RNA sequence: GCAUGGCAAGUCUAACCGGAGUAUCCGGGGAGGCACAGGGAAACCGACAUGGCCGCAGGGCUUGCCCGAGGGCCGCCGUC
RNA sequence: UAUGCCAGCUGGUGGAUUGCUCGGCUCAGGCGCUGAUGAAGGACGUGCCAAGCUGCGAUAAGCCAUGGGGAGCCGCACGGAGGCGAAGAACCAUGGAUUUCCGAAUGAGAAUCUCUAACAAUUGCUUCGCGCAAUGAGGAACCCCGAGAACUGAAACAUCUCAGUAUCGGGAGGAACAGAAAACGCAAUGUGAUGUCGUUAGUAACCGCGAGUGAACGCGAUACAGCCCAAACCGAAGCCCUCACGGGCAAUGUGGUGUCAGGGCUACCUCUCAUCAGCCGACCGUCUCGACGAAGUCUCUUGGAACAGAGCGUGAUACAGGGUGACAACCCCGUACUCGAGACCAGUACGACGUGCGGUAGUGCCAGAGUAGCGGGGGUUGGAUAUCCCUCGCGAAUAACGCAGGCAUCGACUGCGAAGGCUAAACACAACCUGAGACCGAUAGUGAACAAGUAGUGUGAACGAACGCUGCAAAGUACCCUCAGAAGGGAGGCGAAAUAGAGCAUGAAAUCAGUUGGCGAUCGAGCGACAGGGCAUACAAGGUCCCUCGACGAAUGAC
C-alpha cells in the first residue's frame, strides 16, 4: 500500500510503499504473550530471610502441663508457623525462577504483528488513542531526527492532527494501594511512539506519555504497551524502511 | 534515589550546610530580572510576601531563619497564645516570596550578581 | 478455550458454511479443529501423493508438512502449511487456505479428506 | 480456576483420611525402597547383564537411507549431475564426529545414482544398481577383508 | 500426562559476544540436546515414500453402487 | 416488678481495621584488609545544668591547616541561663594534633588496678648491645591446610547413605588456591599452562550390583603469559650494613653461564628485537561526590489551608522521585543537558634503557633418590586389576636413560621428561559505598522502625522481649470557682476539629456503666429454621399491602 510522507510543516511530501510486514495478520494473543514475557523478565528475585523465625533454641515441654506441644522459650512460643514471631511456612524464595522463556520465532512474529497493528486506524482508535487522522502510521521525513526543541515537535504534531493524544496522556493517575510506599505512586496513559533511525528522539521523549524508539530494536512493548495492539506511532522515512526487515 | 523513603530521609538528615537550600524562596519578577535567578536563600534581612497560608497576602521582614527545622519567622505573622502573648507562626519558604534583599554581605551580593553561582 | 483468534474465526466460518451451504466436510473439519491440537492433522506430502486424485480437492483438517514427494497436480486445502510444503506443492499443484476453499466451494463437493 | 485453587475448605486437600498424608510411610519408604518387596510391581528385575567395551574402542557410523538421498536429488542442485552422482559424506549431517559414513537401504530409488560412501548395506547396493546406478567405495571403504 | 501456542523432518539454544532505550530489550551464538532406524551382551548387521482385505467419517453416482484418509485384519521387511 | 434475658442508643474499656513509613528483606554495581607507629573490642571518663544515646579522650559533643560553604550556630534534645559567628562561625572534604586504663597486651603482678627500667616469649641479622628487624591479635563471609560425627536414608540394619556434611585445630589475601605437561590419548599428518562458566551426563565408573553414588577427555565461552634455579663450564669477578671509615657474609661456592625453541664445551655461521632486569607511565571506562540547571505561584468558587473544580497562560535534551496546610513539570529540592573532582582500573598498557636471540658439526660433560617402582596394612574416590593419600618394609636407571597412553610382562608405536622454584587476567564473599524492587508494612518484615542484643533471666556457657501516628501551626489551655491539692472537677480560652488535650489519626469485637424497645418472679434446656400472631419503628437507601365483587381456573372435586 502507500504511505504519505510528511515534512516538518505537516504538508504532504511524496509517498513511499508501506512495507509488507504491516500486512502481517494481527495476532493479539501472541503479542500479549511477548509483552508478558518482557514484563516478567525484568522482575527482581526476592524472598524472606532463610533463618527468619528460626533463631531460637525454643523447645516444647511435651505433655504434662496442660499446654499444647509448642516450642517455647522464656515461656514465649517460638519458631513454628502458627506462632507469633515464628517462621513463615511457605514464603517467597530467592531461588524461584520468575523468568519466562519465549521462542525467537514466536517473539519475532509478535513483533511483526504488532507492527501491522500500527497500520489500522480502527485498531489504534480502539486501543484508545486520540487523533483526527485517516492514514496511520504517521510517516515523516528523516529531518525529524534533527529537531531539538520539544515545543517544535508539538507544533508538528498539532499540524498532523495528532497532538490530541498527548493531551490524553497529560494526566497522571495517583494509584490506589501501597505501591505508593515503594515509589510507584503515579501512572499515566501511553501516548505516541516515535520510531527514528539513528537515535531516539531527544526532542520528543519528554512528551506526555510518549516513548521514543529506534527501528533496529523497537519492540513489542513499545509497539503494543500492556500487550494491547494498535499504538499511535510515527515512523521516520528511514525508520519505516528499516522496520521492513525486522 | 527515585524511592520515596530515601528522598525524605536525605532531606531530613542533610547536614547543616545542605539545609540552606531547604529555606529558599522565589524572587519577585523585578529581582529575578536584576540577579538572573528564580529564587534565593531567604535571610534574616530580606522582606518577603506570604503567598499561601492563612497569612497569604501579608508582607513583612524576615525576623528569623531556622536551618534545622527549615522554617522562617516573618514579622507580624504570629499566633495568639492563651495567656495573651503573641508568638511567631513558622512558615515554609515555599509559600513565600522575597521582595527586598538585605545585601549587607559582600559575599552574598557577590554570589547574587555572579552568573556562575546562586545565593 | 482456543487461543488463536484466527483459528477461532476460521472455525466459525467453517460452520456457517456447513450450515448454509449443503456442505458436510466443513462441519466435519470444524469439529476436528475444535478438538485438542494433538489430535489435529500433521500430514506430509508423501501421503497426499499416495491417495489424492486430480480435480478432487484434498482437505487436511490440520497442517501439511514437507517430507516426501508430490507429483500429482492436486489442490490441497489445510489450516496451514510449512513453508516447504507450500513451496513443494505450488510446484506441481496449488496450496490453498481453508478459508479460500470454503469460499470457492461452500458446498464442500468433490473433496477428499486426508490426515 | 485450578484444582489447587479449589482446595481451601476441603480440609484434606484430596488425600482422604486426614491420617494419610504424613511421611515416607505413606509412600512405602523413601525413593525406590521396596522395589524388591512390597513395591516390586513394575520395576525391571534385579541383576547384572552383559558388558561394555571401553568408550574409546567404539566406532560410531553416521547413517543415511537411500530414500533421503533420492528424495532430494533434484533439490541438491549443488551436487554433480551426469549420464546423478553424489558423495554421501557431503550430504549426511554429523559426518564429522562420525567414524565413517554408511548408506542404508530403506525405501525406493527412483533415479540412476552414483553414490560414494565409506560403506553400504546389501539393500543399499541392490537398490542403487537396480535403478541403473552405481556404488563407489571410498578409500576409507578400502577396509573390506 | 494434559490444554494452548510457534516452527516442522526438524526444532531449541547454553555459557557467552555486540548494540541499546543498559537487569528489560534488538541482534548474534546450534557447543550441545531431543527427534530423523532399529536389533544385539558384544562382534556386527541394518527396515514397507504401501502388496491384499474389511470399513467409520467424508466424497462421488443415474440413490442401492463406487472412491474410501483415519481406523481394523494380514502380508512383507531389519535384527537377535 | 425485683434478680434477670435478647437487641439497640450514649459513654467507656480495648487497639482491631483503613490510611501512613524514619525499619526490614532481597537483588545488583563498586570497593576491600587492620595490628607492637599497640589494632579490633572493652572500661572509665568528657557538657553550665547531663540520666540514656552519639561524639570525643585529661587539648575529652572537641584543637590546627587547606579547600568548600555561608549567616547563622552551640549533636539526638524544641528548657533555662549564658555564649560563639563578617578576626567568615555552623556545616562538609582532605590532611594534621591530642588520643586516660584494660585489651595480642609484651617489665612484673592484677576481675580495667598495682609494684620496681623493660620488644615478655620465639626467632632472623648482628657493631653479640634488644643495636636493627620479624611474629602474636582482629575481620561479614569468601579461601587454603589438617581433625572429623550422628540423627537420617536403606521403610529393620552392619558396607553403603546422611558426608568429607555439622563441628573442632592451624593459617593467607583482597581475593585465595591453581598454573606452563614425566599432560591429553575425539589414536591423530591431532590438542597444547591454570581456574571458572555452559555442555559432555546421571554418560563411563562405584554399589548388601539394594538403596543409592558419580567423574573425565573433548566442545562452546571468559580471560590469556610466560618464566627462574640446581648442575655441566667459569671460580671470588659476588652480597648485606654504614654518609664514610669500618664491619659482616661467602671456596661446605657469593657471583657468571644455563634451564627441551635441552644446555655446556670445541670449530664455525649469523645475529640481537626472545627473554630477563630496571625507567617512565596514562587515555577510555566504571563507582562515588559536586557545580550549573527551563517554565504561573494569575482570575472565580469550595476550603482552616488549593497541591481541588472552572478559566487563562508557560517550560520541556527537564512529564524520575521528594517537599510544601488536599491530586504540583512551571512554589521549593531535584530531574534532562554540560562540566568538575576523588577512587578503582594501574605502577597496567604504551613508550624507552640495558641484555642479547638463533643456526651447523663434533662431544656417552650436565640434567633434582629412599625418589620411580614392588610388597604388607588402612583411609579416600566414580576410579572399576584402571582415583588420590597415609603408614610399615623393600628398592632402579641415568637421556646410549626414564615415565605415560584406564590389568600384568616383553617388543613396536605415539606422547612426555617426575623426584627444585615463581607467575598477571577471567572465578568466591559481602564487611564498606551506592543503586534497585509485581517483597513486608508495626502480632508483618530482622530478635531489633521505639532504651535492641536494650529491659530482663541464668553461677556460667547462653537466653531475651514489648513499646511507631496531637496539630496547618503549640496556637501544648490565660483568668475565675472548688479542693488538703502544680491532682482532679466546674466555667472558660485555642483550633476546621479537642469525641485532635498529651502512649493525643482512625478507634472493630469480647466487654462494662447508664439507658430505650420487647419479654418477665406458675414454669423447661442445641439457643434455631420455615409458618403465622402481639408489641416496637423519623428521613434516607425497599413500596407495597387489605377487603367486596368480577375475569381466568391445573390436579382435585361436592352438599
Ligand atoms: Cl505424514
Ligand atoms: Cl558397548
Ligand atoms: Cl585434542
Ligand atoms: Mg516473623
Ligand atoms: Mg487498601
Ligand atoms: Mg548568580
Ligand atoms: Mg476445619
Ligand atoms: Mg555440532
Ligand atoms: Mg601487661
Ligand atoms: Mg541409627
Ligand atoms: Mg534405616
Ligand atoms: Mg577456586
Ligand atoms: Mg533392602
Ligand atoms: Mg559419594
Ligand atoms: Mg580424560
Ligand atoms: Mg642467572
Ligand atoms: Mg566413601
Ligand atoms: Mg517485630
Ligand atoms: Mg542452671
Ligand atoms: Mg484517638
Ligand atoms: Mg407471675
Ligand atoms: Na535469638
Ligand atoms: Na491451655
Ligand atoms: Na531466581
Ligand atoms: Na487425591
Ligand atoms: Na492429611
Ligand atoms: Na518406596
Ligand atoms: Na521378593
Ligand atoms: Na547443533
Ligand atoms: Na570496600
Ligand atoms: Na546525657
Ligand atoms: Na582519635
Ligand atoms: Na616487636
Ligand atoms: Na639484641
Ligand atoms: Na526406615
Ligand atoms: Na530401630
Ligand atoms: Na555398597
Ligand atoms: Na571435535
Ligand atoms: Na509550597
Ligand atoms: Na603402601
Ligand atoms: Na601419555
Ligand atoms: Na507495634
From Swiss-Prot, chain A:
Q: Which GO terms describe its biological process?
A: translation
Extract the SUPFAM superfamilies matched here.
Ribosomal protein L4 (SSF52166)
What is a GO molecular function of this protein?
rRNA binding
Q: Where is this region: Disordered?
A: 37-103
Per the record, a Pfam family? Ribosomal_L4
**Mind listing the UniProt keywords for this protein, alphabetically?**
Ribonucleoprotein, Ribosomal protein, RNA-binding, rRNA-binding
Output a single Gene Ontology CC term carried by this record.
Answer: ribonucleoprotein complex
Q: Please note every region of biased composition (Basic and acidic residues).
A: 92-103
Look up keyword rRNA-binding and say if it applies.
yes
Q: Which domain of life is it from?
A: Archaea
* Record InterPro entries: Ribosomal_uL4, Ribosomal_uL4_dom_sf, Ribosomal_uL4_euk/arc_CS, Ribosomal_uL4_euk/arch, Ribosomall_uL4-arc
Record's subunit section = Part of the 50S ribosomal subunit. Interacts weakly with proteins L18e, L24 and L37e. Has been cross-linked to L18e.
Q: What family does the database annotate? A: Belongs to the universal ribosomal protein uL4 family.
The record's section on HAMAP family has: Ribosomal_uL4_A (MF_01328_A)
Q: Tell me, in a sentence or two, what this protein's role is.
A: One of the primary rRNA binding proteins, this protein initially binds near the 5'-end of the 23S rRNA. It is important during the early stages of 50S assembly. Makes multiple contacts with different domains of the 23S rRNA in the assembled 50S subunit.
What is the official name of this protein in its record?
Answer: Large ribosomal subunit protein uL4
Q: Which organism is it from?
A: Haloarcula marismortui (strain ATCC 43049 / DSM 3752 / JCM 8966 / VKM B-1809)
- Provide the taxonomic classification: Archaea, Methanobacteriati, Methanobacteriota, Stenosarchaea group, Halobacteria
Curated annotation (Swiss-Prot), chain B:
Q: What is the similarity comment for this entry?
A: Belongs to the universal ribosomal protein uL24 family.
What is the protein's given name? Large ribosomal subunit protein uL24
- Tell me what organism the protein belongs to: Haloarcula marismortui (strain ATCC 43049 / DSM 3752 / JCM 8966 / VKM B-1809) (Halobacterium marismortui)
**Keyword terms of this UniProt record:** Ribonucleoprotein, Ribosomal protein, RNA-binding, rRNA-binding
Q: Which domain of life is it from?
A: Archaea
| Record SUPFAM superfamilies | Translation proteins SH3-like domain
State whether it acts alone or in a complex, and with which partners, per the record.
Part of the 50S ribosomal subunit. Interacts weakly with protein L4.
PANTHER family, per database record: 60S RIBOSOMAL PROTEIN L26 FAMILY MEMBER (PTHR11143)
Molecular-function annotations in GO:
rRNA binding; structural constituent of ribosome
Output the NCBIfam families linked to this UniProt entry.
rplX_A_E
From Swiss-Prot, chain C:
Per the UniProt record, one Pfam family is Ribosomal_L27A
Keyword annotations for this protein, in alphabetical order, are:
Ribonucleoprotein, Ribosomal protein, RNA-binding, rRNA-binding
GO BP: translation
Coiled-coil intervals, chain numbering? none
* Alphabetical list of SUPFAM superfamilies matching this protein: Ribosomal proteins L15p and L18e
Summarize the protein's role: Stabilizes the tertiary rRNA structure within the 23S rRNA domain (domain II) to which it binds.
Name of the protein this chain belongs to: Large ribosomal subunit protein eL18
In its UniProt entry, the species of origin is given as Haloarcula marismortui (strain ATCC 43049 / DSM 3752 / JCM 8966 / VKM B-1809) (Halobacterium marismortui)
Question: Species lineage, top-down?
Answer: Archaea, Methanobacteriati, Methanobacteriota, Stenosarchaea group, Halobacteria
Gene encoding this polypeptide?
A: rpl18e
Swiss-Prot record, chain D:
Q: SUPFAM superfamilies per the record? A: Ribosomal proteins L15p and L18e (SSF52080)
Kindly list any coiled-coil regions of this protein.
none
| Keywords annotated in UniProt | Ribonucleoprotein, Ribosomal protein, RNA-binding, rRNA-binding
For this protein, the record's InterPro entries field holds: Rbsml_uL15_N, Ribosomal_uL15, Ribosomal_uL15/eL18, Ribosomal_uL15/eL18_sf, Ribosomal_uL15_CS
Q: Where is this region: Disordered?
A: 1-58
Compositionally biased tracts (Basic residues): 1-28
One cellular component term (GO) for this entry is: cytosolic large ribosomal subunit
Name listed for the protein in its UniProt record: Large ribosomal subunit protein uL15
Q: Which organism is it from?
A: Haloarcula marismortui (strain ATCC 43049 / DSM 3752 / JCM 8966 / VKM B-1809) (Halobacterium marismortui)
Amino acid at each position: 500500500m502507500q504511505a504519505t510522507i510528511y515534512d516538518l510543516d505537516g504538508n504532504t511530501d511524496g509517498e513511499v510503499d508501506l512495507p509488507d510486514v504491516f500486512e502481517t495478520p494481527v495476532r493479539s494473543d501472541l503479542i500479549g504473550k511477548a509483552v508478558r514475557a518482557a514484563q516478567a523478565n525484568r522482575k527482581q528475585d526476592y524472598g524472606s530471610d532463610e533463618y527468619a523465625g528460626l533463631r531460637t533454641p525454643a523447645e516444647s515441654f511435651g505433655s504434662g502441663r496442660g499446654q499444647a506441644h509448642v516450642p517455647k522459650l522464656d515461656g514465649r512460643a517460638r519458631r513454628v508457623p502458627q506462632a507469633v514471631k515464628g517462621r513463615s511456612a511457605h514464603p517467597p524464595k530467592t531461588e524461584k525462577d520468575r523468568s519466562l522463556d519465549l521462542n525467537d520465532k514466536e517473539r519475532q512474529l509478535a513483533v511483526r504483528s504488532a507492527l501491522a497493528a500500527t497500520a489500522d486506524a480502527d485498531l489504534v482508535a480502539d486501543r484508545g488513542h486520540e487523533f483526527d487522522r485517516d492514514e496511520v502510521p504517521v510517516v515523516v521525513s528523516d529531518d525529524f531526527e534533527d529537531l531539538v526543541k520539544t515545543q517544535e515537535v508539538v507544533s508538528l504534531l498539532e499540524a498532523l492532527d495528532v497532538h490530541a493524544d498527548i493531551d490524553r496522556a497529560d494526566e497522571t493517575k495517583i494509584k490506589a494501594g501501597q505501591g505508593s510506599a515503594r515509589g510507584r505512586k503515579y501512572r499515566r496513559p501511553a501516548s505516541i511512539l516515535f520510531v527514528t533511525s539513528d537515535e531516539p528522539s531527544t526532542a520528543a521523549r519528554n512528551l506526555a506519555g510518549a516513548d521514543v524508539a529506534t527501528a533496529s530494536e523497537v519492540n513489542t512493548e513499545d509497539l503494543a504497551p500492556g500487550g494491547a495492539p494498535g499504538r499511535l506511532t510515527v515512523f521516520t522515512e528511514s525508520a519505516l524502511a528499516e522496520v521492513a526487515e525486522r | 534515589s527515585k524511592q520515596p523513603d530515601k528522598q525524605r530521609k536525605s532531606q531530613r538528615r542533610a547536614p547543616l550546610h545542605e539545609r540552606h537550600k531547604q529555606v529558599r524562596a522565589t524572587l519577585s519578577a523585578d529581582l529575578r530580572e536584576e540577579y538572573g535567578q528564580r529564587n534565593v536563600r531567604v535571610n534574616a534581612g530580606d522582606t518577603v510576601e506570604v503567598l499561601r497560608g492563612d497569612f497569604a497576602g501579608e508582607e513583612g521582614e524576615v525576623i528569623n531563619v531556622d536551618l534545622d527545622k527549615a522554617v522562617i519567622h516573618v514579622e507580624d505573622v504570629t499566633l495568639e497564645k492563651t495567656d495573651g502573648e503573641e508568638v511567631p507562626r513558622p512558615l515554609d519558604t515555599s509559600n513565600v516570596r522575597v521582595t527586598d534583599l538585605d545585601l549587607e554581605d559582600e559575599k552574598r551580593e557577590a554570589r547574587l550578581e555572579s552568573e556562575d553561582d546562586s545565593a | 478455550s482456543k487461543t488463536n483468534p484466527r483459528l477461532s474465526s476460521l472455525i466459525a466460518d467453517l460452520k456457517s458454511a456447513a450450515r448454509s451451504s449443503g456442505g458436510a466436510v466443513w462441519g466435519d473439519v470444524a469439529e476436528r479443529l475444535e478438538k485438542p491440537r494433538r489430535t489435529h492433522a500433521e500430514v506430509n506430502l508423501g501421503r497426499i501423493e499416495r491417495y489424492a486424485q486430480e480435480d478432487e480437492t484434498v482437505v487436511v483438517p490440520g497442517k501439511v508438512l514437507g517430507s516426501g514427494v508430490l507429483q500429482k497436480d492436486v489442490t490441497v486445502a489445510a489450516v496451514d502449511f510449512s513453508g516447504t510444503a507450500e513451496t513443494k506443492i505450488d510446484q506441481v499443484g496449488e496450496a490453498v487456505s481453508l478459508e479460500q476453499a470454503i469460499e470457492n466451494n461452500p458446498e464442500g463437493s468433490h473433496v477428499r479428506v486426508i490426515r | 480456576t485450578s484444582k489447587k485453587k479449589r482446595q481451601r475448605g476441603s480440609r484434606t486437600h484430596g488425600g482422604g483420611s486426614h491420617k494419610n498424608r504424613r511421611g515416607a510411610g505413606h509412600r512405602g519408604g523413601r525413593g525406590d525402597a521396596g522395589r524388591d518387596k512390597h513395591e516390586f510391581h513394575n520395576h525391571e528385575p534385579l541383576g547384572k547383564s552383559g558388558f561394555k567395551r571401553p568408550q574409546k574402542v567404539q566406532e560410531e557410523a553416521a547413517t543415511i537411507d537411500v530414500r533421503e538421498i533420492d528424495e532430494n536429488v533434484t533439490l541438491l542442485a549443488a551436487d554433480d549431475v551426469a549420464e546423478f552422482r553424489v558423495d554421501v559424506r557431503d550430504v549426511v549431517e554429523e559426518a564429522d564426529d562420525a567414524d565413517y559414513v554408511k548408506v542404508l537401504g530403506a525405501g525406493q530409488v527412483r533415479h540412476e545414482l552414483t553414490l560414494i560412501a565409506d560403506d553400504f548395506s546389501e539393500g543399499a547396493r541392490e537398490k542403487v544398481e537396480g535403478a541403473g546406478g552405481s556404488v563407489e567405495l571410498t578409500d576409507l571403504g578400502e577396509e573390506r577383508q
